[PDB]
């Protein structure tokens, strides 16, 4: 589908689709790029993540709007449409999890690349958990837990506590604890530790690195106030 297009040309068109806010096009161009079978640069990684985050973004927001309507009660139309949107979102999460496990997740590389992709794996299993039920839910929750746990163990060993990728991982694992695993104690406990351990080392940073770390510390602090 993107098979006949040059890798450089897919990257260029992913950038045009982002400028045109055509996130579905951007996601399909970046998928064809990944399928060329070469590693992604830090910039390319971010374009892939942006594209699929905006696609799955729109579907999770729609799904939320329909779920709340469904909950306030009754013909089957609200459930049927909620289910179609659910089904599309699962289609997109399955595509991301497939690209991650077929092409992006490797034992090679720096800590930055390996944590980035295991965090993403946690995020997309977390999006599936948001809509799952029954025995399927239990398996999905374990998948999200193991992706995040594997990512946490790397980031604790190979990265300082201020590293924005470590901090965004810790923020998303805390969201998982609060929203999916129904453990608000572990959510608050991780967010609080992540924040305090970062603040201890803030003085080692300068310029954009200081700003990038405090950006994510603010979101940990936002969740901590909302949750306590």
């Amino acid at each position: 589908a993107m098979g006949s297009m040059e890798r450089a040309s897919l990257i260029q068109k992913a950038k045009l689709a982002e400028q045109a806010e055509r996130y579905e096009d951007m996601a399909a161009f970046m998928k064809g790029a990944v399928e060329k079978g070469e590693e992604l640069s830090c910039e390319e990684r971010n374009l892939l993540s942006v594209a699929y985050k905006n696609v799955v973004g729109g579907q999770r927001a729609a799904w939320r709007v329909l779920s709340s309507i469904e909950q306030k009660s009754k013909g089957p139309e609200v459930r049927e449409y909620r289910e179609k949107v659910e089904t599309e979102l699962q289609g997109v999460c399955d595509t991301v999890l497939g690209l991650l496990d077929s092409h992006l997740i490797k034992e090679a590389g720096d800590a930055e690349s390996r944590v980035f992709y295991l965090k993403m794996k946690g995020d997309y299993y977390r999006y599936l958990a948001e809509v799952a039920t029954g025995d399927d839910k239990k398996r999905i929750i374990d998948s999200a837990r193991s992706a995040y746990q594997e990512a946490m163990d790397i980031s604790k060993k190979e990265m300082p506590p201020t590293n924005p990728i470590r901090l965004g991982l810790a923020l998303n694992f805390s969201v998982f604890h609060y929203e999916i695993a129904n453990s608000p104690e572990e959510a608050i406990s991780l967010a609080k530790t992540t924040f305090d351990e970062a603040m201890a080392d803030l003085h080692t940073l300068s310029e954009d690195s200081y700003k990038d770390s405090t950006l994510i510390m603010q979101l940990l602090r936002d969740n901590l106030t909302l949750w306590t």
């Binding site: 971010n46 993540s49 942006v50 985050k53 905006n54 965090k119 995020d123 924005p164 965004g168 991982l169 923020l171 998303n172 969201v175 609060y178 929203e179 954009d208 990038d212 950006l215 994510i216 979101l219 936002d222 969740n223 909302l226 949750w227």
Partner: peptide, 10 residues
């Protein structure tokens, strides 16, 4: 509601 890691623009 609850906030998760944003997209990074730089």
């Amino acid at each position: 509601r609850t906030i998760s890691a944003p997209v990074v623009r730089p």
